[PDB]
From a paper:
Formation of active [name]-1 reverse transcriptase (RT) proceeds via a structural maturation process that involves subdomain rearrangements and formation of an asymmetric p66/p66′ homodimer. The viral RNA codes for a p66 protein that forms an asymmetric homodimer in which the RNase H domain in one subunit becomes destabilized, leading to subsequent unfolding and proteolysis in order to form the active p66/p51 heterodimer. We utilized the isolated polymerase domain, p51, rather than p66, since the initial subdomain rearrangements are largely limited to this domain. Two different fingers/palm/connection (FPC) subdomain constructs containing the same interfaces that are present in the monomers and in the [name] of the RT heterodimer were investigated using both NMR spectroscopy and X-ray crystallography.
However, picrate, which gave a strong STD signal, was also found to promote crystallization. STD studies performed using the FPC construct identified picrate as a high-affinity ligand, and X-ray crystallography revealed a trio of picrate molecules bound to the fingers subdomain surface involved in dimer interface formation. The FPC–picrate complex contains a cluster of three picrate molecules located in a surface depression of the fingers subdomain between the β2–β3 and β7–β8 loops. The three negative charges are neutralized by residues Lys20, Lys22, and Arg143, with the latter forming a stacking interaction with picrate 1. The β7–β8 loop, which has been shown to play an important role in forming the interface with p66, follows a different trajectory in the presence of the picrate ligands. The well-defined picrate cluster was observed in two different crystal structures and defines a specific arrangement of the component picrate molecules. The picrate cluster also forms a lattice contact at which two FPC molecules interact, with the PIC3 molecule common to both clusters. Overlay of the FPC–picrate complex with the [name] of RT indicates direct steric conflict with p66 residues Trp88 and Glu89 on the p66 αB-β5 loop. Additionally, the picrate 2 position conflicts with p51 residue Asn138. Thus, both direct steric competition with p66 and alteration of the positions of the β2–β3 and particularly the β7–β8 loop in p51 will interfere with dimerization.
Author numbering: 0 to 63, 70 to 88, 94 to 218, 231 to 239, 318 to 322, 324 to 417
């Protein structure tokens, strides 16, 4: 749908910070084609615009039906802060459905003076020739500012559902809603559908959600660390903690060998599951320590990464 110019909100970088300049890594010809197709459609719809030679910023993109993912980590660090509470009962619910509500953002303009800092490049084959440069004209998915700016509209949209379903907990984290109830699974799913239809009535398309059942699964609100380690061979272990001695949670996953898997793919799965669990339990995304070289991770992680968010991580 079309945007409303009066919903443009002024935004800026943190004092004395410039915009991001993180280079586009090489992509496969398949991924480049997909990005060209996606970006040609976004441009036709006014959501991005080609930029000229003056703009010096850059944020990396990649492709994962294909979807474009932007790694806004550096822009997010440089973006101003914005002036939710996590329900302790969300993890006690029989079911929690996660819904991606990032589609909302395409309908909301981005401050024209901030657009330049969202510049990105569709790379050429092997990065041999200059790529195709674009910036965002609307709130971008994965950008810190987008859920903050949309919160007032999200609240107005959710209000009738919340008023009619007091037994349902709705917690928002970044670009997702976590919808929790103790209903029979069929009844819970019906409430999810009613919620998706409400969102859609207001122009918010959502993917099918993914279902958690966390009642089958000393925190200090002031950073979370998740460490994954190799346990011999054959399985993975992880520790979630803030101070080194006391763990808050520990767990295991299998480290399987096969023609369709590898350590990076499995580690990305584990990162996504530990993150989701951490958001549910504590409302925080951990920083990760992964049992792999940075070079091998930096090489391959984008090949399997299905999340719209991207956490911070260290290595051996
Ligand atoms: O990847 N990059 O960071 C990047 C950046 C610029 N630039 O103007 O700041 C480019 O012109 C290109 N380029 O044209 O391929 C790439
Ligand atoms: O397409 N590209 O994103 C691209 C990227 C880079 N770079 O170093 O990141 C280049 O140097 C060139 N290049 O040299 O044309 C192109
Ligand atoms: O291909 N290029 O012409 C090119 C140009 C610029 N630039 O800022 O003028 C870059 O930053 C990059 N880059 O960072 O890859 C590439």
């Amino acid at each position: 749908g079309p945007i409303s110019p009066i919903e443009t909100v002024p935004v800026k970088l943190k004092p004395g910070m410039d915009g991001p300049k993180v280079k586009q890594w090489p992509l496969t010809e398949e991924k480049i084609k997909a990005l060209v197709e996606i970006c040609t459609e976004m441009e036709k719809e006014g959501k991005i615009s080609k930029i000229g030679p003056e703009n010096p910023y850059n944020t990396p993109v990649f492709a994962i039906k294909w979807r474009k993912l932007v790694d806004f980590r550096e822009l997010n660090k440089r973006t101003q802060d914005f002036w939710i509470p996590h329900p302790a009962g969300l993890k006690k619910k029989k079911s929690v459905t996660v819904l991606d509500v990032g589609d909302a953002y395409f309908s909301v303009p981005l401050d024209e003076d901030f657009r330049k800092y969202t510049a990105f490049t569709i790379p050429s084959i092997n990065n041999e020739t200059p790529g195709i440069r674009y910036q965002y004209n609307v709130l971008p998915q994965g950008w810190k500012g987008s859920p903050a700016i949309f919160q007032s509209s999200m609240t107005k949209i959710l209000e009738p559902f919340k008023k009619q379903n007091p037994d349902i907990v709705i917690y928002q984290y970044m670009d997702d809603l976590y919808v929790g109830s103790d209903l029979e699974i069929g009844q819970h799913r019906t409430k999810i559908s009613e919620l998706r239809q409400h969102l859609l009535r207001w122009g918010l398309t959502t993917p099918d959600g993914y279902e958690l059942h966390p009642d089958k699964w000393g925190y200090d609100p002031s950073d979370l660390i998740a460490e994954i380690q190799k346990q011999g061979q054959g399985q993975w272990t992880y520790q979630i903690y803030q101070e080194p001695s006391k763990n808050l949670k520990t767990g295991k996953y299998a480290r399987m060998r096969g023609a369709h898997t590898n350590d990076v793919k499995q580690l990305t799965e584990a990162v996504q599951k530990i993150t989701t669990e951490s958001i549910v339990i504590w409302g925080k995304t951990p920083k990760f320590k992964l049992p792999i070289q940075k070079e091998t991770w930096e090489t391959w992680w984008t090949e399997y990464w299905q999340a719209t968010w991207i956490p911070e991580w260290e290595f051996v």
